[PDB]
C-alpha cells in the first residue's frame, strides 16, 4: 500500500483527501520512514516549482518529533 499511500499523500498536499485516508496516511507516516520521506521530497520539489528556499537532506522534523514525543 505504499503507492496508494503516496497518492493519498498527494491529495493531502492539495487538501483534497478524504477524511478516512487522511487518518490512515498519518498513521502510516509514523511507521514507514520512506512514506514521510516522500512527503518531505514532495514539498521539497513543490518549493522548486515555486522557487522557494530549499536545503536538501535537512530533517529538523525528526529532532522536533523526538523532542515532542513524550508529553
Amino acid at each position: 500500500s505504499r503507492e496508494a499511500l503516496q497518492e493519498t499523500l498527494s491529495a493531502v498536499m492539495d487538501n483534497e483527501a478524504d477524511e478516512l485516508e487522511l487518518r490512515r496516511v498519518l498513521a502510516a507516516c509514523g511507521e514507514d520512514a520512506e512514506l514521510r520521506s516522500t512527503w518531505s521530497r514532495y514539498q521539497l520539489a513543490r518549493s522548486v516549482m515555486h522557487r522557494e528556499p530549499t536545503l536538501p537532506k535537512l530533517d529538523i522534523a525528526a529532532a522536533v518529533s523526538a523532542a515532542l514525543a513524550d508529553e
Binding site: 514521510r36 521539497l44 536545503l55 536538501p56 522536533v64
Partner: protein, 168 residues
C-alpha cells in the same frame, strides 16, 4: 489557509500531522532563523525550539490567519528572543559548496522532468500548483473526472520524485 486539512489535525492535537508541517516548512523557518543567528548549527537548534514552541502554543492559534503566517512569527519571536536572551539587541540559506551543487542538480532535475511530462500531467499539476484550482475546478477545465485529476497530479509528482530519489 493553504494547509487546512493538515491544520485541522494539529489543532486537534495530532503530532504526526505536526511532523508534516515541520517537514514541509523546515527550510523557510531556517532561512528565517539564519538571518538572525549567523551560525549554521545554532540556527537549527533555534529552529527546533521555535517549532517545539510552535506546537506548545497551538492553543493560542485561532485560525484567524494562515497557519504559516502565524508559525512564521513564532519563529521570528524565538530568534529575536534568542538575541534578547544574550545582551544582543535584535535588529538566507547558506550551505556547504557540496550542497550548493546538489541543490542546483535537484533544481535542474525538477524542471527537466516537468519539461518532459505528458501534457495532461503538466497541465493538471500546474493548474493545482500555479492556478490554485481545486480538483473540482480542474476536472471542469480539462473536461475529465475528478478522480483523473487526483491521479494525473500524483503521477506528475511521482515522476519528479522518482527523478530526485537518487539525489536524496
Amino acid at each position: 489557509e493553504q494547509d487546512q486539512q493538515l491544520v485541522e489535525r494539529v489543532q486537534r492535537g495530532d503530532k504526526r500531522a505536526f511532523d508534516l508541517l515541520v517537514l514541509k516548512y523546515q527550510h523557510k523557518i531556517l532561512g528565517l532563523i539564519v538571518r538572525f543567528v549567523h551560525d549554521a548549527q545554532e540556527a537549527q537548534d533555534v529552529a527546533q525550539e521555535a517549532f517545539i514552541k510552535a506546537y506548545r502554543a497551538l492553543g493560542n492559534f485561532r485560525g484567524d490567519s494562515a497557519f504559516y503566517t502565524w508559525l512564521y512569527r513564532i519563529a521570528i519571536n524565538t530568534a529575536k528572543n534568542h538575541l534578547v536572551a544574550r545582551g544582543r539587541r535584535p535588529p538566507k540559506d547558506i550551505e556547504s559548496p557540496e550542497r550548493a551543487m546538489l541543490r542546483d542538480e535537484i533544481e535542474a532535475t525538477v524542471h527537466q522532468t516537468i519539461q518532459q511530462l505528458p501534457e495532461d500531467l503538466r497541465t493538471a499539476l500546474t493548474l493545482r500548483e500555479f492556478e490554485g484550482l481545486s480538483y473540482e475546478d480542474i476536472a471542469t477545465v480539462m473536461q475529465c473526472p475528478v478522480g483523473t485529476v487526483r491521479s494525473r497530479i500524483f503521477r506528475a509528482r511521482e515522476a519528479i520524485d522518482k527523478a530526485l530519489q537518487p539525489l536524496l
